Design a protein around this ligand. Structure first.
Ligand SMILES: CCCCCCCCCCCCC/C=C/[C@H](O)[C@H](N)CO
Ligand SMILES: CCCCCCCCCCCCC/C=C/[C@H](O)[C@H](N)CO
Lengths: 59, 252, 64, 278, 178, 128, 252, 59, 111, 56, 178, 64
């Protein structure tokens, strides 16, 4: 019951590793340091009537 | 033109002709609690438009050497009619808010305001290892006032503008939902806060949800002959309010 | 013979003034004050005072 | 995964359906859902009755007895120590087992062994690592009588050797009973004439443990103390029982001092607090 | 009355003025002195969090000619303990008519802001109050005893749950039992 | 045995009583007066032993009212509706006579700094 | 058996084991105002289950020589929580009612009660050409008491049982929705009044909608040794209540 | 000869683990802490002529 | 865990390997009052034993909170009358740890 | 693997499109790409926001 | 002006000779004293390498009749700090006209030879300078205040990145907080 | 304020919590001593007839 992911590696020049979960609890697992997504659309641009960035956005 | 904005809630209406842009929250619009995240079991009271309407707080006068003001909003709306009464008879409550701060001047005036909604603004005491009285934190509809130099009143909040009471740099307060009331071009300090807490419903008196702050960075300054009295009026409307756990009359 | 603190924290750029540099027996709540070691200048954003707390240890003092 | 039951929404009612009026005289617990008396809302409930199950309630490593024995004593009877196996000399695990009347489980056993140097004149030694032997005697076997007895030669008896500094010893033991389950409570006699000994003491019959230092007689006294940790697992239980109110007095009966029902009050109604002032 | 069977008997008689009080206690199964050593309280003292609704059953153990009504009421916390009958009728109450069906069920719902409450005493998870009030009176005919006895039960619903294993605060041992 | 209860402290007029840890033997309550008021007396009390029972160590303090002093008269100008006592957040509005021109803010208000009443700024002036 | 009845409203429940039959109105069940018969224009407040629930009034003691009691229900429910508050902040209101009157005795007692709901019970004064004080008509949750002989207190209601205050024969009061509390066989004085007025919504303080009356025709009578104290408890729940025209706090 | 079950995890926001039995006896195995079923129909409602909960259940 | 031999006259000993016990008490449980108390008997409380010279102890603990998340900042009071204690001190409620030497009283002080 | 955003090439401009003039009074952080004010080149950027995440 | 709100107010007035200077600082978010304790600087002091472009926003908080132009300029390092207006117009500059749109954005691009720069001070990764110059003047009508205030913002672009976890040089503790 | 006069003492029996002034609708509850039996209603209350205070009925009696 193993699962294979990719190792973090350099760019411009896909090596795999293995992981097996041994314990019965979800707090026992290793930390998930491979989630790189983001969404800064709720902190920047937190407005109504979404602006255009080419118009003056007033008058 | 997009300088005009009308906001209708309940039986009250605010029209502005020199608005800039309405901010809404962290991207989230206020909405009633779903029954997949709910904890309490009895039927909630979503009252009417009887609470979801604009209430006018008192006005503060913005002078040349004024420093700042703050309010505490689940406690500041404690005597505004049926919102205050439904606060006083229920155990749990939950509401978003639409805050509209007014201030006007002429084109010959200058000065800039910062209007922030700060969730969980845990204030610090003036003398360090000493209790804080409830009247110095929240004074109902009456604003408490920061100072310029450090303060040392007993059982009082440490009120310096360059630390904003909490103990951070005041130029870093633009991470919360905010706008600027630049008297050159604004009157639209509109901020639609959703409900932000770590429990799905909470008590209104025991917990303060957030803190409005009006801090003038570029001070009010005018030439001789213009109107010296410039008031600031804060209008607030709860949104999507509901109540749960009815019992006898609460703690005034 | 009340409870007393230690010698105040030796900084590599600050030394004590001269009512405090000689005398022992620092009680609780006692404030001491530092001056710049002779060749240095003051940083105006930091106040050079140290209070001894209830657990007989001074407050944090870093670089004045 | 078996979630708890949900709450269904309800409304007003005016009918001859009466969920509130029941008869508690019929030995019957009423099953009134909270949506039957007041108006409720739809609550999708996500709670799990996981850590209230009998396995999640009993499978903790509890403690049952402490055993002390020395490595250099003038009397030969304090150079080793024994313990007849019951689970009834510590009140916590005894009360937790006496929630139920008959139980059936396997036991995972751990010993935690600590040695203390006793007081003597020649207290500065250079002692190598101590080694312990923990021997189990089934009911009826031959018992040792000294530390140098040849009855310790463990040819059939299971015995466990341990060296100081390692992990504690641990072994599992299956269901060592002659009945279909264990008996926490036995209301009967030993002899058929209804005489003899009364209670659960007839049904223990578990044998006993024996402890000694494997090393020879040292030049300075060292006492060792070993703590037996039973940990029940693969558990089933039948015909539950009210929890014990009064305090235990012995290990071989249920005899007690009469305690009242609960903590007292000052009056039978409640009101607001009558302390200091506004 | 702890050292007798009279701890379980709640007194009720005919009253010369209606609207009085009968008993009352604090809804804390495992901290409050009333339901401390109960079956639900003794299961519940080996835990540290609880949730779900609680039932309460009131058996009237009196004469067959006696009749009367009671006000079985639960009041959520935030205010004080109610002091009149007209303040306690604002809560979650039920009016119970004594008749041929001699027992009623007061089901205390789950009104909280957190998913669990503590079995011990802290101020953040206070839970409310249970009071009972004379609705009219006890009315008996001649040569029938006035003073009767109400018995109270307690149980849990089908949505009750406990979370954190701890040791009970009631087990006490000084030496080994030998 | 179990601890005895000190009596209920009750209320202070224009003040709080903070009871963090109950009112049993060995407790501590604290005292604080509101905005525009000053505490006179004790800031904390203990549930100590007194005789055969338990009592509080210090009596109940008092919250007096803080007043800013008398408002300054300006030259060539009066105060619209001069009150006798000026508490916290209260302001005086300076008018100005015929033939004279105001300079600056019309109104000053009362502040409390270091538990002392004080007006917020200098009063205006009429030149003409 | 049909002697058992459970009534659930809001978070309150009344169970009776010796009921006889629930009466409901003039055939009409209470319901919210339709928008084809409505007059006011703004959005009404149908609050929650926060007002549609049972409220317990005070108890009166029924003695051997007691005569009668009455209440005034849009005024009697003036301090019962959120119903009282929504009365005090709104101009218009509208509600049906479910009245449940309790009284119990043993099988060795005898006596009969009459429980009527009388719409528009315009009371008459004791001395003829004289004003009536508001406290003598409606005393909140406290019952006013008829007499046997004619009364002559100044500024008081003419309170004789053989005329019922209004000036009719008291044996003719069985034309209104009524039941009997016969202590032989009843406890079910349940009467579900619809809203009866000549305007679609009305003021709660200025107008009294109806009057409950408990008049014992066959008096309470018992042998020596039985319980002499027999209380009567009146429980009332508003139904389908809604409110309109929000303004500041009203007239207490 | 391994078997894969699910780990106990939180709700409202299926991770697998592995288990191999090494010893020859059934008392050697790990404890079965994942049986969550129940049936309180023998302790509550322990009667004959099963009641309805809407009827008075007498007379 | 590190041990230092304190200063004494009889400082030349021959001490075996020290053993430590680290006991966690959930909020509300019974607390020890001595090193030889019978409240240390860890029948329900999770406790961790360690022998000197090995790898350090390590255990994971799940989300032990009563709310939907932890609170770093809490702007409120403990009592409903807006009195009491102010701030995040009402929401800690985590219980406490207890540490002792499993060995008996030695002949020389070791911290 | 979520790389950072790239830089697109640009050229001269003379129009009524003003990315620089914004209103910072609307509680709004402006989103001016560096290719909007100066002439930039095509840069294929390989940087990863890995060790700034909340877990890291 | 550190101990007030006046640290954030940049002075601007009408000048009797054009071509002067307004302010200036060194582009080092985390080492330079100006943007040291900023939000970008406080995220950025827990790191040790940074890369990407940085935005700068200038809000003119003055009268509605006042008008004037400024020269917002970035000069890459290798030369000194520019001393005239005509030396600083050789860099990467923008001329900002004060009008109805009261704020401009100076976007400082990524001009480097290495893929990262250090958040601390070393001479191998110097980063440049930000200066602002009066382009014409401030021109006001009569009875309007001359002396006004410019406010400066800072942020990061959508290609900003940090690499090496270290501890912040600002956290300081002497004893435990009890 | 209208007051009913002083409540009548019964032979062999006391009043539970006798107040000093008795206004409108207020009642006194008669208890009864050991060895004596109540007859009739326990409590009488105050009424106003012809603008005059008056108790509602006769007080009970204890025979034994
Ligand atoms: C070589 C190591 C062997 C260690 C032997 C120690 C344990 C062996 C005895 C079997 C354990 C039985 C546990 C107790 C059974 C019943 O539950 C009790 N009588 C209580 O009912
Ligand atoms: C037998 C070993 C058990 C060791 C117990 C030690 C840790 C148990 C306590 C739970 C840890 C909670 C961590 C802190 C939670 C919150 O983040 C803090 N209150 C800060 O918000």
């Amino acid at each position: 019951g193993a699962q294979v992911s990719t190792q973090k590696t350099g760019a411009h020049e896909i090596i795999h590793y293995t992981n097996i979960n041994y314990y019965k609890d979800a707090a026992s697992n290793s930390a998930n340091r491979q989630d790189f997504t983001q969404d800064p659309g709720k902190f920047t641009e937190p407005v109504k009537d979404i602006m255009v960035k080419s118009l003056p956005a007033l008058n | 033109s997009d300088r005009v904005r009308s906001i209708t809630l309940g039986n009250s209406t605010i029209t502005t002709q020199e608005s800039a842009n309405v901010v809404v929250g962290y991207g989230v619009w206020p909405d009633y609690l779903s029954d997949e995240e709910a904890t309490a079991e009895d039927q909630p009271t979503q009252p009417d438009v009887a609470t979801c309407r604009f209430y006018t707080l008192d006005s503060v006068s913005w002078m040349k050497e004024s420093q700042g003001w703050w309010w505490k909003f689940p406690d500041a709306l404690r005597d505004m009619g049926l919102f205050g009464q439904n606060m006083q008879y229920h155990y749990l409550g939950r509401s978003g808010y639409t805050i509209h701060v007014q201030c006007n001047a002429s084109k010959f005036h200058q000065g800039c305001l910062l209007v922030v909604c700060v969730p969980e603004a845990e204030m610090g005491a003036a003398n360090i290892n000493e209790k804080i009285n409830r009247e110095h934190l929240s004074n109902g509809e009456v604003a408490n006032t920061f100072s310029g130099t450090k303060s040392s009143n007993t059982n009082d909040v440490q009120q310096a503008v360059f630390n904003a009471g909490m103990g951070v740099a005041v130029g870093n307060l633009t991470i919360f939902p905010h706008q600027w009331i630049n008297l050159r071009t604004n009157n639209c300090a509109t901020i639609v806060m959703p409900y932000i807490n770590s429990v799905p419903m909470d008590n209104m008196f025991r917990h303060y949800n957030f803190t409005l702050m009006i801090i003038p960075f570029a001070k009010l300054d005018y030439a001789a002959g213009s109107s010296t009295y410039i008031p600031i009026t804060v209008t607030v409307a709860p949104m999507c309010a509901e109540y749960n756990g009815l019992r006898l009359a609460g703690h005034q | 013979c009340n409870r007393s603190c230690e010698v105040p924290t030796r900084l590599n750029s600050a030394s004590l003034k001269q009512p405090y540099i000689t005398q022992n027996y620092f009680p609780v709540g006692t404030v001491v004050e530092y001056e710049c070691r002779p060749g240095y200048r003051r940083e105006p954003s930091l106040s050079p005072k140290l209070t001894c707390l209830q657990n007989l240890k001074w407050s944090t003092a870093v670089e004045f | 995964v078996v979630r708890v039951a949900d709450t269904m929404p309800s409304g007003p009612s005016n009918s001859e359906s009466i969920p509130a009026l029941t008869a508690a005289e019929t030995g019957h617990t009423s099953q009134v859902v909270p949506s039957d008396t007041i108006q409720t809302r739809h609550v999708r409930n996500f709670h799990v009755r996981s850590e209230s199950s009998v396995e999640n309630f009993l499978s903790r490593s509890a403690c049952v007895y402490i055993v002390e024995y020395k490595t250099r004593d003038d009397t030969p009877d304090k150079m080793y120590d024994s313990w007849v196996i019951n689970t009834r000399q510590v009140a916590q695990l005894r009360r937790k087992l006496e929630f139920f009347t008959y139980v059936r489980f396997d036991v995972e056993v751990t010993f935690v062994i600590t040695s203390v140097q006793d007081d003597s004149t020649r207290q500065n030694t250079d002692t190598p690592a101590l080694t312990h032997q923990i021997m189990y005697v089934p009911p009826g076997g031959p018992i040792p009588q000294a530390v140098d007895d040849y009855n310790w030669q463990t040819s059939t008896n299971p015995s466990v050797f341990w060296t100081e500094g390692n992990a504690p010893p641990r072994m599992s033991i299956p269901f060592m009973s002659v009945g279909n389950a264990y008996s926490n409570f036995y209301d009967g006699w030993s002899h058929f004439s209804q005489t003899g000994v009364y209670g659960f003491n007839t049904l223990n019959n578990m044998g006993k443990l024996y402890f000694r230092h494997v090393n020879d007689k040292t030049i300075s006294p060292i006492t060792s103390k070993v703590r037996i940790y039973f940990k029940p697992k693969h558990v089933k239980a039948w015909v539950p029982r009210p929890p014990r109110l009064c305090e235990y007095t012995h290990k071989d009966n249920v005899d007690f001092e009469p305690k009242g029902v609960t903590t007292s009050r000052t009056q039978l109604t409640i009101s607001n607090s009558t302390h200091v002032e506004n | 009355n702890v050292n007798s069977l009279e701890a379980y008997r709640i007194p009720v008689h005919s009253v010369t003025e209606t609207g009085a009080q009968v008993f009352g206690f604090t809804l804390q199964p495992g901290a409050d002195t009333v339901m401390e050593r109960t079956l639900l309280g003794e299961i519940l003292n080996y835990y540290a969090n609880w949730s779900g609704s609680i039932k309460l059953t009131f058996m009237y153990c009196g004469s067959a000619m006696a009749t009367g009504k009671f006000l079985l009421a639960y009041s959520p916390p935030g205010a004080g303990v109610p002091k009149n009958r007209r303040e306690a009728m604002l809560g979650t109450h039920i009016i119970w008519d004594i008749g041929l069906q001699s027992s009623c069920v007061l089901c205390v719902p789950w009104i909280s802001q957190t998913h669990y409450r503590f079995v011990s005493k802290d101020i953040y998870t206070d839970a409310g109050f249970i009071t009972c009030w004379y609705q009219t009176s006890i009315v008996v005919p001649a040569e029938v005893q006035n003073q009767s006895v109400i018995l109270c039960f307690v149980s849990a619903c089908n949505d009750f749950s406990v979370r954190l294993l701890r040791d009970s605060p009631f087990v006490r041992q000084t030496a080994f039992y030998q | 045995c179990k601890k005895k209860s000190c009596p209920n402290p009750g209320e202070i007029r224009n003040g709080q009583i903070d009871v963090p840890g109950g009112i049993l033997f060995g407790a501590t309550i604290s005292f604080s007066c509101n905005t525009g008021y000053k505490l006179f007396g004790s800031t904390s009390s203990f549930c100590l032993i007194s005789g055969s029972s338990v009592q509080w160590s210090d009596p109940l303090p008092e919250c007096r009212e803080i007043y800013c002093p008398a408002p300054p008269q300006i030259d060539n100008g009066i105060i619209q509706g001069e009150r006798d006592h000026y508490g916290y957040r209260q302001s005086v509005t300076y008018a100005c006579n015929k033939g004279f021109t105001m300079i600056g803010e019309h109104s000053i208000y009362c502040t409390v700094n270091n538990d002392e009443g004080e007006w917020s700024g200098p009063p205006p002036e009429c030149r003409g």
